[model samples]
Target: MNIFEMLRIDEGLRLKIYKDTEGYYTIGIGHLLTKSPSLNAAKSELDKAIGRNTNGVITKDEAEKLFNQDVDAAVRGILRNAKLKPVYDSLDAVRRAAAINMVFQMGETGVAGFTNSLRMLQQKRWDEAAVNLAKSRWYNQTPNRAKRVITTFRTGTWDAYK
Candidate 1:
């Protein structure tokens, strides 16, 4: 299957906004409404696309389109961060995907906040990085996803959770 297809499966599909594992208002397969600018833009676009009276409901096609846009932005945000560029580029596909997913959920600044984890990753200290990832508000906020990401970081396996 294609990479996007795999990503869709990994991320799971959701057509409406619901609190994520982290208690953040999320919609369309993990698009977070935790902050402004992007959140505002998403709201505008979604309203324009499907109307506000729809009660935040979207079709699978709409969700797929939104997911694509969101993933692109996440990837771009990861690449644009000078601090994360080297580490992101150095990893293989699975780890890179995990990092991108983190960027998707946490945004660039949020991911950058994991200084120790990033440092451990850059130094090839996989276990330490995984532990560092686990010992965070992000972990507590979303244990299942955090564990999956930590496993990916530690084992270099895309399907670590599976």
Candidate 2:
């Protein structure tokens, strides 16, 4: 499925995508435009940073390539590192899938680096998880277009799905 389809966007999100990418219908998140002289070059850099192919703008294939390792590692490691290991070990497949989607949007490093929050997770503290997730500095750094994606993954709140 397409990235947008996977994210389950709404019309508001569609409009935001148009405004951000200027009608670039391609899937995946787009970073903010900067003072850089070459927009194409910037996109290429982002593509590579996210593990997309260096040849061009991000495509499904490139996303898949990066996600295979980075995203997978994030989700698996988070649950494993958290003391919720026993609980997650008994979780249903659907919950596992949802958690994987969360990790995929964030990265293994991002999740691992969440020092305080990671500790909350390691303690299986749901209330702290919510609080720590909301307080993340990562959200401040995330591009406007991708904030919702990060929010949804971090909070498991379907309201942020778009």
Candidate 3:
């Protein structure tokens, strides 16, 4: 399956407004609507995307577009980080996907902070890398997703996400 499919599963889907762990107003999968300058702007953007002003509700199609943009953005974030750029370039396609996947949970800054883990990944030390991943606070923050990415790092294959 595609990485987007895996991420859509990872993030889970939503159609109405809700709060994220950070208590920000979120909608449509994992879109942080409040990040749009202000709450009013966020609602207008959401309403425009869905072609209706139905309070906090959004359509699946627009939610999907948000996911695509979010994914594309994180992909760019990974490629843009000077430190991660080299490590990202060192991995195979599956592991490359894992790099992007990991970024979705913690942002590029978080992923970039894994100095030794990135080095292990750069050296292709999957076992060490996977073990090291388990040591992070991120592991506890999202164990299942972290485990899946760690497995991908360890195996260098899509089987984990499968």
Candidate 4:
């Protein structure tokens, strides 16, 4: 299935991710989940980090702070997983998800700083590509929903937003 389809995003979410006014675009949760579990956890964690209830919505500042903390940790965990690394190595359908997730949660600077992965991609070194890709996830703050987009982009099956 298409990643966007899986995430259940309409034009609004797509626009939000593209716009990213508060840098919340880096954290993909608000763009997708508006209900319980995922949204609640994201809201609760963001509230704790920012010391204020999001009131079911997040501000740009709050999103920025969350990106620096919670999202970063989560992305790091994804990178460390051996299974996830293979997606990057193969540039398989999963690699796009991983890359997009890394950037979405971490921001452009954080994503750009993926020296190892960049080196591998640049060199076309697929053997250890996963290692390079694994290193990119740490700096991101909110990566959950971004992973969905990454999955879409990696598979070359994404065309909905356009």
Per-prediction backbone clash count: 0, 0, 0, 10
Q: Write the per-residue lDDT of candidate 2 for residues 1-162, one digit (tens) a residue.
A: 333344334212221112233323222333232335565655565565656444444556545444454444545675666543443454344334444444554544555566675455445565666566666664554444345543444454544543
The digit string of per-residue lDDT tens for model 1 on 5-97 reads 545655688887666664555677766644334545555555765555446678888787778888899889988998888889888787887
Total backbone collisions, model 4: 10
Q: Residues 43-138, candidate 4: write the lDDT tens digits.
A: 565456557755455666554444345435544554664543443455555444445455444444555565665556545565454444433434
The models' CA-based lDDT, in order, is 0.76, 0.46, 0.82, 0.44
Worst 10 residues of 4 by lDDT: 10-19
Candidate 3 residue lDDT tens string, 1-162: 667877877778888877666566778767776654466776776787667776878778878888888889888998889989999999988888888887876789999999999999999898998999899998987788789889988998778766
**Candidates, ranked, lDDT:** 3, 1, 2, 4
| Candidate with best TM-score | 3
Please give the TM-score that candidate 4 achieves against the real structure.
Answer: 0.34
Question: TM-score for model 1?
Answer: 0.81
Off by over 4 Å in 2: 1-102, 143-159
- At residue 144, what lDDT does model 3 achieve? 87
Query: Largest lDDT belongs to which candidate?
Result: 3
